[PDB]
Design a binder for this molecule. Structure first.
Ligand SMILES: OC[C@H]1O[C@@H](O)[C@H](O)[C@H]1O
Ligand SMILES: [Mg+2]
Ligand SMILES: [Mg+2]
Lengths: 79, 76, 72
């Protein structure tokens, strides 16, 4: 008894629901990826800070050691 | 000749056909009327799916016979 | 089959692929549009990093799926 477009409009409404389910399914996929990336970049930022901190303490200890040698030197060359 | 086409939600349409019309022809008539793509349509009569290359007379579809229409629904 | 690749800058590029394409094919297609060498590309889908030898259908990647590009 289908009026102009009545079957047509059920078809369009039913296609819309299939599309909405795909978008819902994709949202779960894309939120897993976006939280994965957040963690990955945070872990790589922490690693580089740890490396840079290791470099800083090595340079600071070299400085102290250089001064230790320098004092033993200056006492030897001036008396 | 008038035949009727019915979906699983209870809706019925009327089509003007000739027994020598193929099923592909019928599905094109349904497209022109309801905007459903032929490759999304499945038609059923007398316990079988109707193949595109066969005619209505091949399946003994006559005046005021009722076909069932099943829609393939595609987001993909 | 069309899929999307999202960069950290937020832009989206579109790729034409087939289910049989490997992740390595996809990195080559990203190279062709962005100029990024494949060996600097990490690809992520559904929260996991994709392996070069496996195929898109191996990961259930289908049309209008979104892959995420993160550079090494
Ligand atoms: O591998 C991804 C799976 O997770 C959901 O999105 C779907 O059921 C599958 O595609
Ligand atoms: Mg037409
Ligand atoms: Mg190339």
């Amino acid at each position: 008894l289908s009026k102009p477009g009545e079957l047509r409009r059920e078809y369009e409404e039913e296609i819309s629901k299939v599309a909405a389910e795909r978008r819902a399914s994709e949202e779960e996929e894309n939120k897993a990826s976006e939280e994965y990336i957040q963690r990955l970049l945070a872990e790589e930022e922490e690693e580089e800070k740890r490396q840079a901190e290791k470099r800083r303490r090595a340079m600071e200890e070299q400085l102290k050691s250089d001064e230790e040698l320098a004092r033993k030197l200056s006492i030897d060359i001036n008396n | 000749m008038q035949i009727f086409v019915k979906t699983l939600t209870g809706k019925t349409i009327t089509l003007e056909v000739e027994p020598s019309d193929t099923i592909e022809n019928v599905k094109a008539k349904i497209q022109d009327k309801e905007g459903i793509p032929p490759d999304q349509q499945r038609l059923i009569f007398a316990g079988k799916q109707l193949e595109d290359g066969r005619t209505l007379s091949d399946y003994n579809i006559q005046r005021e016979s009722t076909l069932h229409l099943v829609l393939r629904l595609r987001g993909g």
